[model samples]
Target: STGSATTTPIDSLDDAYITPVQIGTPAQTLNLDFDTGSSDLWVFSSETTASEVDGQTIYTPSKSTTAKLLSGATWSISYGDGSSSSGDVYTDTVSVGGLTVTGQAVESAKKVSSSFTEDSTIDGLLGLAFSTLNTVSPTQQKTFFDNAKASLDSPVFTADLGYHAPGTYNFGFIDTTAYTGSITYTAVSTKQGFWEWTSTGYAVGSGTFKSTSIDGIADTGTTLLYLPATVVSAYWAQVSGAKSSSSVGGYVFPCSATLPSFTFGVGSARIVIPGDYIDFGPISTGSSSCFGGIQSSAGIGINIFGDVALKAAFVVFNGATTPTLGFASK
Candidate 1:
């Protein structure tokens, strides 16, 4: 839910690498997913071999004077995609997109494996979702917004979920394109601090009637709109002469001569989910179906409108005054 955009609107971020912060200084630059699902800043450290981080950066405890380990608080987390990792604990100063606050308690990943150690590009994940889902337990671990909260004019965070993954993220500011009118809010529910959410509706092909509102999670870390079969089928109903084409792994449609622009709606806000965003390119299947790249995790229940879809809209995260997240067309 949006309040009022009375503060300065932030356009873009210049530098967007993740670095550790401890005692008012940056420790080391570590790769991050820049996630919003959870609020925990972590890094892959010396315990991980150099080969594990082939094309990525790593942090050395020996190279830092400000690194502070959290004695015995080791942590591990797992995701649905058969990925997991665990590491020792530590606190340090981390900087992102030029925002720096010191003494940020972070997880120094000592031993990492799974999807973590294999990908050199994704060093770590920055959970910016609900503070309730924040990995910081027992107390507040200084997170990205934790430090920037004080400096924010409105102390409001905005997320512009792009078409694909890893578009851009802006804290303490919003993109006007996504903020067309007023904002809405819903309190961060106490249910596991996830602040569960459901989309009011979805749009496609020049604002066609795909008004079936779907319930889902709004995660800034994700890149695609994972839709339920009911919603997806209802949406394809609108495409002018849009029909399903055969594909191997995912959903696809005949490119045909006519395709329509699509958007996701929150209340009255229409965020166009462009067709170009879909990946119909050649895949391992080789049939070359016009795959609606917007990934669907059918068994997960509900939906997760990932970053790719969110980046298109201006999200107003109201943790200070209302504790409700607001959305508007930027």
Candidate 2:
């Protein structure tokens, strides 16, 4: 069996990608962020405080006949951005794009952070990272993908993130037509509970490729691409009027400055992110200073190839015994 779903950016900035998910017997559909950086399929639900919910959809497990509470089970998760959520666990029939999985762990949120409460476009998050990263306590639960993998034609999923547009997530089979050129495969380290891999090197704009290894995780949940400070400085140096601002909390530059494209290597293949993709947007409404999409990961301690980088190509999250990642030009 295989499944497919459409993922759309929550805002023009491509802040996050949300996909519709069906839960319980009657199918209460909610738009959830498909986060590849974390594990735990959580949702805003009836159990959540009314004050914590904005315009987002809420899942009512009590309304679903097939829903069963996982007594004594609880979960809590915090992201690098400081957004957090905690809840009780429930087993229910869950479906994503026609793919069904019985007894899928559907974490029901009882509390959420202010950031999540304000983002009405996203109801919750569906984690696609390794099951070991699941935050459930007492008895850890497998992710929806983990439970459904056996039924799927293949133990794999693909993320085709788009820029200011709707993309797709496919399970079980790779959609050859979705990408161009041959795919470049690389070893993945699930030990970190992420789709972590190493890029051969990177080049700024039309500059020569730098021969070095850059290890990072491909995270769909994050909004920007984070690289080493050295690489980030090199990229920003090419643009006029660019500087690291303590006030803005990152590197900012004149909106009129011409930005350079960024290129990274996946094995022998090269994926180029257009210059326009790096010009994230103005720091404020009508501001002439723009924030960059690529920034230093020094503070974060680990590099992250987030939406800014992933949107430029096709990415495959292979769940084989020896997990591997595949990248191809789209």
Candidate 3:
């Protein structure tokens, strides 16, 4: 028997990919952002104040027969984007697609930051990062993949994120039909609880690849690709009228300006992100200024290959000891 499930991603605000996650006994489903950055499975719940929550769905643990309280346990998390949440804990059944993990620690939010409350489209987060990053007090909780690995056909999962379209998250196996060319793999470091890897270099459009070692993370939760300040300036310098707006905190260019494609190296294989994906819509609805999806990771400490970059390739997240990331053209 294949202990796995495949879920299609929903079109989300800000280029995010969302999936329906079923929790509790009667199957209360919530649209959760399957994040590869954070490592906590939390949902807006009855415990959250009505004022703190927007139009998001709430889970009632008391109504579920299979739900059990994890007394004296609590969790709180802060994201790189400054959004944060904190909550109590309960052990319940968390299911995605058809795969189920019983007695999984589900954090029920009691307080959520304004950024979280404002995003009504996103109900919660289903973290796919390493279990070592779990925020559960007293004992670290296992991720859904960690809990189901023993029964799975393979100890791997794949991410196929499409641009402004539906994507797929395959559990426990790789779907060869979804990708083209060979899957080139690179070793990853899990010391930071993220899928961290190094890139040999990057280039703008048809330019030669710059042989610089850039260490970064593959984060599905984030919307943009963040490289070093020097690298970011190099790419933007190729385009006229591109300026770094301190107010907006990233580079913005004229809507009519033709942008160049970005290419990053994964050993011998090169992953190219088309120009269209780089334009993250106009600065606002009616503005003629466009904000770029690639920005400088100056103070962020770590470079992030977020949705903008990851969606350009079909990624395999190998969870078999000393995990590595495999990439192929989608």
Off by over 4 Å in 1: 1-27, 49-51, 135-142, 161-168, 175-190, 206-212, 236-249, 253-259, 285-287
lDDT of 2 by residue, 164-197 (tens): 8999999999999999998899999988899999
Candidate 1: lDDT over CA atoms?
A: 0.57
Q: Superposing all C-alpha atoms, what RMSD in Å does each candidate have to the true structure?
A: 5.8, 0.8, 1.5
Residue-pair clashes per candidate, as listed?
Answer: 39, 0, 0
Poorly placed runs, candidate 3 (over 4 Å)? 1-14
C-alpha root-mean-square deviation, candidate 3: 1.5
Between prediction 2 and prediction 3, the one with superior lDDT is 2
TM-score, candidate number 2: 0.99
Pick the lDDT winner.
Answer: 2
| Residue lDDT tens for model 3, 1-330 | 133333344443346777888899899998889899988999999999889988998999999999999999999999999889999999999887787888899999999999889877788898889999999998889888788777677888888888877778888888889999999999899999999999989999889999889999999899899999999999999889999999977999998988999999898898999988898868888999889989999999999999989999999989997799999997
The residue-by-residue lDDT of candidate 1 on 216-303, one tens digit each, is 6666555456788666666666655444444455555655524455577666656675566554343335543345556556886647
| Ranking 1 against 3 by lDDT, winner | 3
Candidate 1 TM-score, C-alpha based: 0.77
Q: Which runs of model 2 end up more than 4 angstroms from their true locations?
A: none
